[model samples]
Target: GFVNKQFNYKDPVNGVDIAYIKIPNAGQMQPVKAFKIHNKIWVIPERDTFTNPEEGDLNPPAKQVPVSYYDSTYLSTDNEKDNYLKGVTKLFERIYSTDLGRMLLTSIVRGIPFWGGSTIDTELKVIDTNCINVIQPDGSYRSEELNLVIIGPSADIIQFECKSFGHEVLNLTRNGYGSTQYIRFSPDFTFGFEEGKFATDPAVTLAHELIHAGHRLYGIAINPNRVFEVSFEELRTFGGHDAKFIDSLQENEFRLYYYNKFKDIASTLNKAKSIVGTTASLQYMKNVFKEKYLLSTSGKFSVDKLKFDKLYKMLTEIYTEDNFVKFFKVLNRKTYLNFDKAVFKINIVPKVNYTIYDGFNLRNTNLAANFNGQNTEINNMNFTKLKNFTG
Candidate 1:
């Protein structure tokens, strides 16, 4: 009796039934009777009254009446944020119907458990416990010991009633946007937005995470003769070797996907500016790295996309082979290397020795009795110098 679960949006991926639930009563989800009006599962929302000031409302109505066109932004926010939100919505509109869309949505938005062994997942999740794990896929990173590849239901329809680990183990039903092992999302992940723009859209998360997948697959596709790039930036650069390239690629894809699909929605919803995911811009080091990649509202990154459609279309797509299977490497082939624990050993002790200065030391080290001034009797030559130099 705890879930104030809203049987909200029907999934765009054909027949998948979805509802949005808030962890109302407890610090988590209530006993859901399961979907009857709809079969299958509904996602859980993360922003339920989780013991704090509401992190602000999501998708709030645009402030100011139709009689006014905003000066810089509407709802006291920017027009850029509004456009960005619409663009993101567009990405969802564009991908939810296709095969690639459906597959990626399922895999990236939620982990298959069976979906863990993907090369991208493996590389991305290989968090070294010895150091910082705060990697931004959108950029070091962290992890659990479980292999998502080893766990899930395999096209096996018989396991219908079982719940996956994101909920059962991660306790994401009470907290967390999604799990690292599988991108399996809880509805609560949909939280965190102010005024008409959602922060953690499942659509955006799909694109964001999938780009990393693409990067990982590409990392393995080539043999990197060059490595040891730096301290933290990864094995070191040659294009796809690091996360930033893919992170940049994901940004382009995310913006374009949303902008491409949501121009109509943005145009209609463009009453005020859109939501902000924090602003950022290039300092070019004329400033500083912190200034260039700041997390708070001080950055220009968010404000630059003033017109949702205007800026999003120009972005580049993440490069990868055409097929999903080709890009994800669903079964990862990764092995950990311990450069810190490396050891090199060399030992040369010849049984018999000859020097350039003297052909043979017949007295200390004797020449073969069978050496009749020729190398022809080679097999017959017998020598012993188990300890030192010999002829």
Candidate 2:
């Protein structure tokens, strides 16, 4: 004979009461208790009957009782688990469909290259096959169903490597020696059964790895022995290299050329920062562009002109002392030490010898006069009145 009974018990740790509906004749009804475990509640059965079988049995084979448990403190209400699962499913879907994924893909594609200046194309393939698996160093196997692979043309056939896996324990690597190019995601990676539980957003992580892939493909070579310093005066001179070509232009034409050159540098810095995540190198470039090119109503920072002005100040002050330290700290802390160092070095040194006046030749007479004061201004101007008035 089978009988049903209901019992109410309180969790000692949380002081929350739980209700269990049990068939007394079948087995134990009370929840199991174990103090050694953390944040877990187990339901234990008191007695075993003839109707309950440990393994398969003949004749009225014991019916396996379905058990349900809820987070007694937080999820004491009805259908909490069902609601949580639905929320998680939708959250993951949203992340996958958003622009974040596209941005991540774009960053990686742009970062890497093939010979002849071609870029690699990446596609996402979601299939029902068990493509994700882990191969241990000793050749043992743990089967995982969800994984990703990076396929590209090298010389012969497209290559496939497991990026990630589903199971938590199996997906984790003991040594950080293996490649993180591919990542494994488990169904549990999403919120299991909680409000606000959503799918994992992998865009930022994916973008970072794509950056690595690009570097790997491009294979940058740097020479540590060759390094030099240039003064502010030298940088202004180097920047004016293009002025020689535009010297014969009409006034408006020369101004346009000067404006476009500065704009191009600013634009390149902006676009590069967008692709590469925010770093001190990119931020510093942005700050310099803002202070030197964008903020002035006259529309440019004139370094060559500033050289002769008593009040002319260098642009280094635009970067705060704290910010400068942080920028260098980021370079030091980065895992890609060589790459960061290269970027830092490039920021500190100008690519060519040109003055700010040469880079952006504003129409202000004060600027023109200051340069002429050093007998270097392409155009001469009277400075007595302009010197007393600030524009």
Clashes of each: 31, 27
Off by over 4 Å in 1: 1-41, 45-93, 97-103, 106-111, 114-206, 209-391
RMSD of each: 29.1, 30.6
The digit string of per-residue lDDT tens for model 1 on 1-391 reads 1112323223222122221222212233332111112111122212211211232232222212111111112112233223322323333333444455554334332221111111332111112210111222332122212211101111111111111223233222112112222222221112112222112222333343343332222111112232333311121111133423335564455455443333322222222222211231213211221121111143323222454433222111222112322232221111112122111111111224322111222224334332221121231232211211111
RMSD of 2: 30.6
Candidate 2 lDDT over 1-391, as tens digits, reads 0001122223332212122222211343332221111111112211111112342122121111111111112222233322222222222232234343233233222321111111211211121122222333454433322111221111111011122222222212111111113311111111111112111112222223333332222121111232223222212212223212223343244234434444443344434413222332434434533443332242333323233121111111211112221321211111111111000000101213112222112334432333222222232221111111011
Compared with the true structure, model 2 gives a TM-score of: 0.16
Which residue runs of candidate 2 sit more than 4 Å off their true CA positions? 1-100, 109-181, 184-187, 190-391
- Candidate 2 residue 28 Cα shift, in angstroms, is 53
Evaluate model 1: give its TM-score: 0.22
